[PDB]
Symmetry: C2
Amino acid sequence: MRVALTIAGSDSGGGAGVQADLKTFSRFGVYGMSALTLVTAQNTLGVQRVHLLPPELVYAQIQAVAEDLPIHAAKTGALGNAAIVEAVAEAVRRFGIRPLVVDPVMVAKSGDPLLAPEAVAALKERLFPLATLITPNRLEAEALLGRPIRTLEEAEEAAKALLALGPKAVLLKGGHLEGEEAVDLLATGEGIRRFSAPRVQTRNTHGTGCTLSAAIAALLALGRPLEEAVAEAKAYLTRALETAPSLGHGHGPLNHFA
Amino acid sequence: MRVALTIAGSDSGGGAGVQADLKTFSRFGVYGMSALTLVTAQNTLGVQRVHLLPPELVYAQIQAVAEDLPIHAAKTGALGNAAIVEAVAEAVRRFGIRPLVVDPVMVAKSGDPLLAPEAVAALKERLFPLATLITPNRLEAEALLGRPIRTLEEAEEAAKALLALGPKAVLLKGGHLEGEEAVDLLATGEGIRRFSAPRVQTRNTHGTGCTLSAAIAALLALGRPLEEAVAEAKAYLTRALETAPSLGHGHGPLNHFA
């Protein structure tokens, strides 16, 4: 049985965070492990309480699981602050946790910042070099690079520029839109590839970022090639959006059984 | 889609706690929600760090999920201390969280105490009356009652005595052993029923307590009758033990996909 680890926050409503990560691992048959960075009281209407865990507790959880159990792939999610980010990178390096899918979690899809600038600098300097893959959204890539991303040419050049920060691969989610489709740009040293996806119109959009990166890491734990992993993960996210339960009053969760 | 809530601790290794609870919910098709009581660094060799969350954060998570999402069933697990126990019962009562499967989590299967005596008194006085079902193991029932449980007659009388504490039903796990089988005693006001299960001999026994109660709550969320729910949950735990992965160096996790 293959194993995947998530290093992310806790969503009490179960649509995002470690909850969405573990539910995705079970959907793909991967054994799921989790190192909690923070705890939130949260529902479909949004967060109500956020409690960041001590950086040493986040390190201890990674040290306890890695010393005892195989880690065939892993992903990181919300990391809270610069201190937790530095502790996560120090564990990932010491224990050799590869493949690692680092989801930036610095700017929300709504445009709300999720990470302090000191935490963003630690995320670029410490965690990015360890990442086999990063998955910024378009606004997050503009913050990391300091440059606008407005055309398909600018998106391709942006995804290549992010490789300079360290990651072996960059998936620029939503870097170009064309009508009712959305285009992701996968950049490696080999070149650039495009991934189409239909633009669903729904309230049930909670946890889309967590779920995608977790599905990529789960497929990587199964040994699938990176291009096939990101392609199969996007199809699952499209089905999870199309068949999502109408739970909650706000941004509803995805259907992880899809 | 039916929904179930767990109110329990976090096991970084993924074999027990909220991780085992959510993995069980996905196995039965139930949408999973979680209110964290505490965070642990843990693997198959045991716990290394335990961080109890503020009682108000545990209350806030329950308040946020219950105000927004349906709860067709729920279970409680590790509760840390008396203050967290009182906060959990106050939320469960205010929000009407029924059916509720309260797993005592006061004495480990190894005999190690898991809860302070002040927390045990709060668990009996505050949380037990709200429970539709409690699932003590034999040592836990001896601590709750103050009486030895050594014969099948003593086990049946013990399971009936626990109904005096408030729960609508009592499942006395392992209250009598006979050869290579283990007998659970389900007591309600209707009477007593017996549930056989083979005694597996394996290292992969981690999370057996969490997994069973979570499967009962998941089946209750699906609308199954209590007797059929506890019976089908035991068959799943037997298959999960028989087909468990040989992960880790110590008490290994169950196979939740079984």
